[PDB]
Design a protein around this nucleic acid. Structure first.
Ligand SMILES: [K+]
Ligand SMILES: [K+]
Ligand SMILES: [K+]
Ligand SMILES: [K+]
Ligand SMILES: [Mg+2]
Ligand SMILES: [Mg+2]
Ligand SMILES: [Mg+2]
Ligand SMILES: [Mg+2]
Ligand SMILES: [Mg+2]
Ligand SMILES: [Mg+2]
Ligand SMILES: [Mg+2]
Ligand SMILES: [Mg+2]
Ligand SMILES: [Mg+2]
Ligand SMILES: [Mg+2]
Ligand SMILES: [Mg+2]
Ligand SMILES: [Mg+2]
Ligand SMILES: [Mg+2]
Ligand SMILES: [Mg+2]
Ligand SMILES: [Mg+2]
Ligand SMILES: [Mg+2]
Ligand SMILES: [Mg+2]
Ligand SMILES: [Mg+2]
Ligand SMILES: [Mg+2]
Ligand SMILES: [Mg+2]
Ligand SMILES: [Mg+2]
Ligand SMILES: [Mg+2]
Ligand SMILES: [Mg+2]
Ligand SMILES: [Mg+2]
Ligand SMILES: [Mg+2]
Ligand SMILES: [Mg+2]
Ligand SMILES: [Mg+2]
Ligand SMILES: [Mg+2]
Ligand SMILES: [Mg+2]
Ligand SMILES: [Mg+2]
Ligand SMILES: [Mg+2]
Ligand SMILES: [Mg+2]
Ligand SMILES: [Mg+2]
Ligand SMILES: [Mg+2]
Lengths: 132, 208, 172, 312, 129, 6
RNA sequence: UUUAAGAACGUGUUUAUUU
RNA sequence: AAACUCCAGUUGACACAAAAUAGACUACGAAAGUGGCUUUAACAUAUCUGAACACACAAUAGCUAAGACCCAAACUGGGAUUAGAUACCCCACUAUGCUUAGCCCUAAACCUCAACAGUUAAAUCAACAAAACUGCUCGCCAGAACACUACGAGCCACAGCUUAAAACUCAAAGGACCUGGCGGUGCUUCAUAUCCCUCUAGAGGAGCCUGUUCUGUAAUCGAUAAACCCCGAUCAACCUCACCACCUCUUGCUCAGCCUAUAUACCGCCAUCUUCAGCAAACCCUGAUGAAGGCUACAAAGUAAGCGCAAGUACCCACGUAAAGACGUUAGGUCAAGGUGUAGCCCAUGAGGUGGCAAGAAAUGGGCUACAUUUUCUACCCCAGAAAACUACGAUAGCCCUUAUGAAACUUAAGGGUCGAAGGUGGAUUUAGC
């Protein structure tokens, strides 16, 4: 049987998100892409460096906002800019969010040598697409 | 297939459409009206509406083709028809006044008759009964015996007994023999008829 | 209750039992009205009426059911096949088909008088018929043709020896 | 579950959002139809997902949320319908009405139309139905038609019939054109495998054909290929009456002939009668051949062949 | 099936309900799931034919006694009245008898409904003054 | 399966 | 009513404001 | 096949053997048992039960003596089958089956349901079977096996029957059911490149390439019925590399490390049935409230979220091909992708350097090229000319030389020269394709 990126059915008590409920054969039919850049286009270059930056960002943000991320990130590149769009929870205090936004935006700008901006969208609870 | 079940096979007959409406029967008339609504497949390249089209010679050519080389198989077919034609003209000029009336020079008439003299009436089927096989005579359908005549003619020519002899000259020689009820292909048909007669008592082993 | 997980079987059986409730009649709200003796399939249950303070001296399952019903004092002996499901289905069967003192009076139109050794010969009327009281008495029977139980007759004659009967046990 | 009050609040957000969307695009909020909403949502939120049911959508709540049955009992608790306890009060109230109209008839005495399908009947009744239930109801309707039904009955039966758009299998004739000299001709296109051909058929000619500027017998040495070019004209008895000038590109030897055969036939339909065009269609001269090369699969030697299988 | 139309009409005329079709399992014992948790079951069931089409008792006779609903039934000589609360021994086959039963139950119900409106009007009118 | 033979 | 058709080692696979 | 061939067929004469149809009847007798015809004799008891201290009977088989003999037939012989066949199949023949006079006294002698009387209501009633009970009486049984045994006794019985234990041993045995699996299990309908028959091209033979197994070597590991075998590898001259030998370092590229053991501790990614269509929460009902089960449309207890199929989507459509394909099955594959539980090494099971093995007696899988004339060479890319059996067809092999890549090539690749081998279409068997 196939296993990649599939959430196995259960009794019915397990909540899943939209992206987590669709398998790889829906990535261009019912889902989009979590990262958007030009590396993988025909005739373009530096697709390998853009991938290592993505892998590091998803981990930097998972450990920098522990227990706060409601769903996967959405990385966007428009020229020199790098826009990180995240959906976070409302448990943490806003004072601590503004601290981490300025700490991460700055640390990542000096690391990758690019202007970085972070966009948060708070939700009360993790959105549920269905129950498996 | 890339066609749906709705698609119907085409009718290349050219004299069928020309039939006047007065001749159309109630059933035939209904059929023509129906075809207008149905979808039709695209005619293949093999068959056209020409007057020289021979479906039996087109099938025999396809049974000789090897690896999709239809240009070569058709070349061998026409060479054989030409060789059979020239051999009869050489036998027609050197014949007596009254012997020229019984010499067929049309290669097609010879090709159809030669194959008809090789068609077997009955065949054999291995029926498993009591951990043994038996050659039970069976009535062959009209298609089966038409296919066997072609396959035996092509197999005999492809035999290795003939050394550095080209296919058009080999096939042409067999067609004349068969046309005269001679040669090995005919003997193969007779042997099948002799093995079915010896195993006639085994006819009851057949249930269909 | 049946299920694959044990926690799910407890719910089904628990929530489904309140929809199949019986009503058990009790004599003075502490015991049964009369001695019962039935057989459900292969399981024999011989319950006996006892006075106040006797306690529950019966199969541990019956002790647990009786507390739910409200029977404080009763004796029972189980024989044959000790199957918890036939034992339970038969217990509820005999406890629901027991005739009270009021039904008996109405049935025969006579007074039901209670005789107690502690109260001497005083006749205590526990139930009387609502309808017309009969004027003729029941025909006294010289010898009753009632089937007896060798186990009870053998005990009354000081013949049932057992090193397991009448043992000191905890309160029930 | 979605209540009536919830739907009423969704109707108010769509109406207000419909006026915002018109203010963005610079249109008139009054004359802003639903076709303009779909065009503006595809520009502002461009999604190329292959599934159109997974793209951003801003429609009317009456087309998004599924239709739901109204409450069937009041405060006191008595249902509103006498066939409520059946569970199918709508399906059986219909069967009760139809069977009541069949009793009255006894006392006082299709091409485009298709019977309603099962899935379309559930929406009308807002009830879930089985297959055998659908067949029983359809049998009463047919029985209703056979009898001398009155005018009022016909209107009822037409609520459960749906029109059908009957396609026409009639070839489309090309417009005859005229050149500078004044000669009439017709142009068409053919396609066989990867070969693509454009053919120009003149109304009057001496049976001359030129492929890519070369006479046909030189361009197609093989006889079989020339037979294909002859099939369209021979079938309609027009050999030596037209002049053809075509240009084929791509494909192989035999695919270019079949592609030209199809184009010549399509362009030859303008200089023949309708009855002949129908005969050409029933002979397979106007149909594009869909048989194309099939792809090879991983784990296989070919499109359909498999690797040699070893049992042990 | 011969009297299905007649009975469905009577229930509509007397503002009552009818179930003359195939009885799905759980209409009474599992009603809250089929209809809804706030559904109200019947307070009285009237059997004009206590048998099904295979000459066996209707499943509702047993399901009604489970839900503590009193039943009225027309029992013929081949029926079982043990669980029917108010049985009426009479023919349940001929059409001349079924029209009578329906006419009697339709009238007794229509009267009571109108009898309460008179008792209430009097009480309401008397109460004010 | 049956044990192997020497 | 209708040929023959053998064999497969031993254990282990369910609870608690500036100022 | 053997046997018979003084055999076969028609007709006629002709039994001490066995008793169609009737019998779809259900009678007689204590049981055993009794079904062709006639005649004679003849089928106990005016309450019931009742002899394992006795009497009289008792299928078939078998014993003793004297007879009969069509057919059948243990034994035996021959033929055949089989790895063997002391059997199943065929042929032949004997004891025996029959009569008479005696013996033997057994059976699944079972309708496994005692005799007489009586009942159909109540709790009808574990299950199955042939519904559940009362009164009275006799007989019999008390875990399995040892045991239709030993000893003793009796009997026309002498390898016999009847009666009938014990020691040692076990924690079960046993009866009736549920579900599933399996059946050289029945009926019916089917398979669509699939089961048979039927089509086309191949494999199995030769050479070469390549993998594997054995053997060999100081010298990896893993896969290894279907579901391994140009498989992890879309790839090994050093490197890669985890192997061998030798040498060297010790808080070590890492707030160390280990390709050390365990895939029968796992995540992860997959194979397989699947070229399937079912899995199932939550309720209800049936079975006396058992394991379990749940359908009939002129409808009889089933309602069902959700997952999968389907539907949609991708490629050139509505077709087709892809993709998809649940729960589970094989403790299936992988600790050597990486991560990781448990256990183990820490001057070594870790790290680094140099060099080196990766072969072939042999067998086998897959594939390539050929054995030629529908061919070979050249031109052309389809109207040609030559070739055509010991200078033909035929090696991508060997040998030699050159070039390319690279620091490094008898080794890898390309080309040239030389060489001209097996091979003459391939055994049992076997693959794929609408
Ligand atoms: K028996
Ligand atoms: K071969
Ligand atoms: K080979
Ligand atoms: K091979
Ligand atoms: Mg797969
Ligand atoms: Mg191929
Ligand atoms: Mg009746
Ligand atoms: Mg053995
Ligand atoms: Mg075994
Ligand atoms: Mg007696
Ligand atoms: Mg006796
Ligand atoms: Mg005897
Ligand atoms: Mg004898
Ligand atoms: Mg004999
Ligand atoms: Mg023998
Ligand atoms: Mg004899
Ligand atoms: Mg005998
Ligand atoms: Mg007997
Ligand atoms: Mg007995
Ligand atoms: Mg007796
Ligand atoms: Mg014993
Ligand atoms: Mg014995
Ligand atoms: Mg003995
Ligand atoms: Mg003795
Ligand atoms: Mg290896
Ligand atoms: Mg291994
Ligand atoms: Mg392994
Ligand atoms: Mg190396
Ligand atoms: Mg090295
Ligand atoms: Mg190591
Ligand atoms: Mg495993
Ligand atoms: Mg696939
Ligand atoms: Mg699908
Ligand atoms: Mg394993
Ligand atoms: Mg392979
Ligand atoms: Mg060479
Ligand atoms: Mg160099
Ligand atoms: Mg040569």
């Amino acid at each position: 049987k196939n296993r990649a990126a599939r959430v196995r059915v259960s009794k019915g008590d397990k909540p899943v998100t939209y992206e987590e409920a669709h398998a790889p054969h829906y990535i261009a039919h019912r889902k989009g892409w979590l990262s958007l850049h030009t590396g993988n286009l025909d005739g373009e270059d530096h697709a390998a460096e853009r991938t290592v930056e993505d892998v590091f960002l998803r981990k930097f943000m998972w450990g920098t906002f522990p227990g706060c991320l409601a769903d996967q990130l959405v990385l966007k590149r428009r020229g020199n800019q790098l826009e990180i769009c995240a959906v976070v929870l409302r448990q943490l205090s806003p004072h601590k969010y503004y601290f981490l936004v300025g700490y991460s935006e700055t640390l990542l700008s000096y690391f990758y040598k690019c202007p970085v901006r972070l966009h948060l969208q708070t939700v009360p609870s993790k959105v549920v697409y269905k129950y498996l | 297939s890339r066609y749906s079940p709705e698609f119907k096979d085409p009718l290349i007959d050219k004299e069928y459409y020309r039939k006047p409406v007065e001749e159309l029967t109630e059933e035939e008339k209904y059929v023509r009206e129906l075809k207008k609504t149905q979808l039709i497949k695209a005619a293949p390249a093999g068959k056209t509406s020409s007057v020289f089209e021979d479906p039996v010679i087109s099938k025999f050519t396809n049974m000789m083709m090897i690896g999709g080389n239809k240009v070569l198989a058709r070349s061998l077919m026409i060479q054989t028809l030409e060789a059979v034609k020239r051999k009869q003209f050489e036998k027609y000029h050197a014949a007596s006044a009254e012997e020229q009336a019984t010499i067929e020079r049309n290669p097609y008439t010879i090709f159809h008759q030669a194959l008809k003299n090789c068609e077997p009436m009955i065949g054999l089927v291995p029926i498993l009964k009591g951990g043994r096989f038996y050659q039970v005579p069976v009535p062959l359908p009209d298609r089966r015996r038409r296919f066997l005549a072609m396959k035996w003619m092509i197999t005999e020519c492809r035999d290795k007994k003939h050394q550095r002899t080209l296919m058009p000259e080999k096939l042409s020689h067999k067609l004349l023999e068969a046309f005269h009820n001679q040669g090995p292909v005919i003997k193969r048909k007779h042997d099948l008829h002799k093995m079915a007669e010896a195993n006639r008592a085994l006819a009851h082993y057949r249930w269909w | 209750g049946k299920a694959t997980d044990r926690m799910d079987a407890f719910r089904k059986a628990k929530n489904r039992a309140v929809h199949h409730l019986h009503y058990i009649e009790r004599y003075e709200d502490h015991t049964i009205f009369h001695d019962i003796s039935l057989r459900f399939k292969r399981t024999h249950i011989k319950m006996k009426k006892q006075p106040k303070g006797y306690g529950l001296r019966c199969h541990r399952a019956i002790i647990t059911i009786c507390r739910l019903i409200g029977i404080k004092d009763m004796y029972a002996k189980v024989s044959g096949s000790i199957n918890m499901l036939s034992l339970t289905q038969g217990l509820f069967r005999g406890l629901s088909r027991q005739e009270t003192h009021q039904q008996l009076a109405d049935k025969k139109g006579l007074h039901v008088v209670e005789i107690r050794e502690e109260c001497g010969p005083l006749p205590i009327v526990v139930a009387s018929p609502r309808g017309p009281l009969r004027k003729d008495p029941e025909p006294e029977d010289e010898v009753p043709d009632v089937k007896l139980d060798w186990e009870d007759v053998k005990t009354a004659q000081g013949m049932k020896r057992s090193v397991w009967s009448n043992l000191k046990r905890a309160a029930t | 579950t979605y209540t009536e009050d919830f739907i009423k609040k969704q109707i108010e957000e769509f109406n207000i959002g419909k006026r915002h969307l018109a203010n963005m695009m610079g249109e008139d909020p009054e004359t802003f139809t639903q076709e303009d909403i779909d065009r503006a949502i595809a520009y502002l939120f461009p999604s190329g997902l292959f599934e159109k049911r997974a793209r951003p959508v801003m429609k009317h709540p009456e087309q998004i949320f599924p239709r739901q049955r109204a409450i069937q009992w009041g405060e006191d608790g008595r249902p509103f319908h006498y066939l409520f306890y059946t569970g199918k009060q709508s399906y059986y109230s219909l069967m009760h009405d139809v069977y009541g109209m069949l009793l009255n008839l006894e006392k006082h005495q299709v091409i485009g139309s298709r019977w309603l399908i099962k899935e379309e009947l559930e929406e009308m009744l807002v009830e879930k139905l089985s297959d055998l239930d659908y067949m029983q109801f359809i049998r009463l309707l047919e029985k209703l038609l056979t009898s001398q039904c009155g005018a009022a009955e016909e209107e009822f039966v037409q609520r459960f019939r749906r029109s059908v758009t009957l396609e026409s299998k009639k070839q489309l004739i090309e417009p005859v054109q005229y050149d500078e000299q004044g000669m009439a001709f017709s142009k068409s296109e053919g396609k066989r495998k990867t070969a693509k051909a454009e053919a120009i058929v003149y109304k009057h000619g001496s049976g001359r054909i030129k492929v890519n500027g070369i006479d046909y017998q030189l361009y197609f040495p093989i006889t079989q290929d020339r037979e294909q070019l002859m099939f369209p004209f021979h079938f309609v008895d027009r050999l030596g009456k037209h002049d053809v000038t075509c240009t084929v590109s791509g494909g192989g030897r035999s695919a270019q002939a079949g592609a030209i055969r199809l184009a010549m036939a399509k362009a030859l339909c303008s200089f023949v009668t309708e009855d002949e065009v129908e005969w050409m269609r029933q002979a397979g001269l106007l149909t594009t051949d869909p048989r194309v090369r099939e792809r090879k699969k991983p784990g296989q030697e070919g499109a359909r062949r498999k690797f040699t299988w070893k049992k042990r | 099936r011969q009297f299905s139309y007649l009975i469905e009409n009577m229930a509509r005329d007397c503002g009552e309900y009818a179930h003359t079709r195939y009885f799905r399992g759980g209409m009474l014992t599992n009603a809250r799931l089929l209809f809804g948790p706030t559904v109200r079951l019947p307070d009285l069931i009237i059997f004009l034919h206590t048998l099904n089409n295979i000459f066996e008792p209707h499943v509702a006779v047993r399901d009604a006694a489970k839900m503590n609903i009193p039943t009225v039934g027309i029992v013929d000589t081949n029926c079982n009245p043990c669980l029917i609360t108010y049985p009426v021994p009479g023919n349940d086959d001929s059409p001349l008898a079924v029209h009578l039963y329906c006419r009697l139950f339709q009238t007794a119900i229509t009267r009571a409904k109108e009898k309460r409106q008179q008792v209430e009007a009097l009480y309401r009118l008397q109460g004010q003054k | 399966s049956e044990p192997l033979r020497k």
